From Swiss-Prot, chain A:
Lineage: Archaea, Methanobacteriati, Methanobacteriota, Thermococci, Thermococcales
Complexes and interactors: Homodimer. Interacts with HerA.
Gene, per the UniProt record: nurA
Purpose of the protein: Involved in DNA double-strand break (DSB) repair. Probably acts with HerA to stimulate resection of the 5' strand and produce the long 3' single-strand that is required for RadA loading. Exhibits 5' endonuclease activity and both 5' and 3' exonuclease activities.
Organism in which the protein naturally occurs: Pyrococcus furiosus (strain ATCC 43587 / DSM 3638 / JCM 8422 / Vc1)
UniProt record, GO biological process: DNA repair
Name of protein: DNA double-strand break repair nuclease NurA
Length: 430, 430
């Protein structure tokens, strides 16, 4: 249906972005700082990615996660099937985290078995993307603070410490199955272990509820002027301190306390894979596109597509190469809580030092990709290159072809035994 | 697959049932299951919608369609548009306009309906978009931001002026449906925002260094100020600050793009609320949902149609058509709708006053169980909808579903092929 009307309004929407993204500063001048893509040294490599499938049966979400790493060594796969209680946003976000947790575990364990003088892991995605806004954002920090407040700081520290220990065990256990079988169907520790931890750190201290946390634990953005007129005689600093020091009481069901715990565990388990993956000396992320909205908000960066445009339009190139981005970027302390950080020292190192960012075009008329790494693109680029075959690299292509979801594994299937076991009825609520 | 996985997932689901089947509240109420009412003749329109979204680098290309089939001719609404990517915000403004199409169409369809008892049947739930609207937190903080920046008086002006363009817009839209029975510009905001931007924002705002503007804070009817105003004067005393506010000395430095979005979101929100308000004008209005059930639905102050259904044939082995009327009416949390807005929508006000009536309904013997929600008592609406029963299901909604799933994907070639035309082929393949 033609609709000559909306097209232009669309066109303009886009063109107003390109035509006007020239900044009036003309790119900042960074363009001519463009380079050719370097030589192709040699490296042993792994490309990992993920695919998920979610099905909603009424208030319960059934999902199947799959991580796979292709490259030099044998194929490795982590898989998790599971079901969760439905919250519109919070549900999706739990699943994303586990999705990333699986890949992080996996990039790492795949690095360990990676043999050669030069080892590198290739992640499909961005480092910054998950670091600026943690999936389940409001909810991970809230749960942690609820917990910290519930059982106290000191107990909490043990809870933490114990759980990390369980994580150490867990990784070693996963690794072994991977060498034996090349696959493991229980990559997620938290679901197995929440039950015991609840009875231990909570079930004792509780009665058949009310907790006090700081205001900041889930943000108004405005304040009624009464609070000001009411603070006359004080200093803005005292005010802002009272506002920060402000505390709140909450009332917590068994379900809410349970939820506070499982989130905490999940979030620790997640941050734990980040930390480990960060070991990889040569670490690479690749993405066609990312969100620039908060990126320039907490150095200035544009979008891959907008760059490519300005490339052919203004400078008439359309050719291979790359453009390094002059500034490393340092992650938000807001995202990663105070206490936890002393645990993950690679997170720590990242906050201290930064992530390296470069735009990259792999082939002649080929598109541009966004590359991030723990260390200088200068070093890491060539190794990634050593695997180039077609429009892009062999290992990467093979992770995107490989975990390319089949007709869902669980579609009529992991459902249809759920048909036979007991109740076809929830199955009916597709 | 795996058996332990299947056994856990099956464990997970059977526990859920088991708790339900434990019969806390549910012992009495299930026995209150009652036979369908004798049907009453009615003229009806069921409305449903679909959307397709496609992300191009940062941008979202989307298409909305709302269909109403029934006792009159088919009525259609379409909108195709593009909107920049913000993780939560994007997905959430599309939904809000979707809901907006369905709402109008339901309202418009009602007014073209000839009969003695006229009714509208909506795919959805009235509660779902109340308990957690397309809204929170973003668009309310938007509003508070907006109110704060341009101040109350000039905000009431924007509000009232926009509500005038809507009244006019609805009438325009009504005529195009009457001739052609379809209209391709049902959404107003996108076409009117830059105008209202210039009139309401540009006036009050001076340019600043990069992508930023200087904004003075206006003065005095609930007076509210950007928290940033406190954060930015820390050497000062509350007196100094209040006195600067009065003299209008206080300035702010905000992203040009942020103020714009805030505006946009504001209008989108008011426009979505107008539509709900207009829909509520329908005397016989019903929502039908095979599944809703968030854990937040219940908790506020009520089980899953899926659980109940599997319990009923379990406890009572009924599997009978019929309905169970939830005894008390649900009134939505006022946190949904801001105080200063409610005045502009009286039907949304009544809705709060009175409430929403809810029932579980099985339209035929073996069929699934639906959540049915209404502005009048189930006793009254249920027979009007029953007049249209066809399958284990109501004919018009069946046709609405079928008719909206008729969505065809020329969506690539639509813009992608044609938006190479003015300038840039690049964003197409990203």
């Amino acid at each position: 249906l033609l609709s000559k009307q909306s097209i232009e309004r669309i066109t303009k929407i886009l063109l107003d972005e390109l035509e006007n993204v020239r900044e009036n500063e003309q790119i900042r001048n960074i363009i001519n700082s463009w380079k050719p893509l370097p030589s192709p040294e040699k490296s042993s490599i792994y490309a990992v990615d993920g695919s998920r499938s979610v099905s909603r049966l009424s208030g319960t979400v059934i999902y199947f996660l799959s991580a796979l790493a292709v490259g030099s060594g044998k194929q490795l796969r982590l898989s998790y099937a599971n079901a969760i209680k439905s919250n519109y946003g919070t549900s999706d976000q739990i699943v994303r985290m586990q999705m990333e947790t699986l890949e992080n575990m996996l990039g790492y364990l795949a690095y360990r078995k990676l043999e050669g003088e030069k080892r590198a892991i290739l992640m499909d995605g961005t480092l910054t993307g998950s670091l600026v806004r943690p999936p389940v954002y409001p909810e991970d920090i809230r749960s942690l603070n609820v917990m910290r407040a519930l059982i106290g700081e000191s107990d909490f520290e043990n809870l933490l410490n114990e759980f990390l220990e369980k994580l150490r065990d867990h990784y070693r256990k996963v690794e072994e199955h991977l060498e034996k079988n090349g696959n493991y169907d229980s990559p997620i520790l938290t679901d197995n272990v929440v039950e015991k931890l609840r009875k231990k750190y909570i079930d004792t201290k509780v009665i058949a509820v009310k907790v006090k946390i700081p205001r900041k634990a889930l943000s108004p953005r405005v304040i009624p002027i009464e609070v000001l007129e009411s603070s006359r005689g004080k200093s803005v600093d005292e005010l802002l301190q009272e506002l920060d020091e402000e505390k709140v009481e909450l009332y917590l069901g068994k379900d809410d306390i349970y939820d506070a715990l499982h989130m905490t565990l999940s979030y620790i388990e997640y941050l734990y894979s980040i930390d480990k993956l960060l070991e990889v000396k040569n670490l690479a992320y690749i993405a066609k596109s990312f969100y620039t909205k908060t990126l320039a908000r907490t150095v200035e960066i544009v979008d891959t597509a907008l760059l490519d445009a300005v490339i052919r339009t203004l400078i008439g190139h359309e050719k291979e190469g790359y453009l390094e981005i002059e500034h490393a970027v340092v992650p938000p302390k807001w995202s990663f809580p105070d206490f936890l950080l002393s645990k993950f020292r690679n997170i720590e190192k990242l906050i201290d030092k930064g992530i390296h960012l470069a735009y990259v075009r792999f082939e002649q008329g080929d598109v541009i990709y966004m590359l991030q790494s723990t260390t200088n693109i200068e070093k890491i680029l060539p190794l990634i290159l050593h695997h180039k075959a077609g429009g892009y690299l062999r290992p990467l292509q093979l992770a995107h072809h490989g975990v390319k979801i089949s007709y869902k594994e669980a579609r009529h299937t992991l459902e249809a035994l759920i048909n036979a076991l007991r109740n076809r009825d929830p199955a009916l609520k597709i």
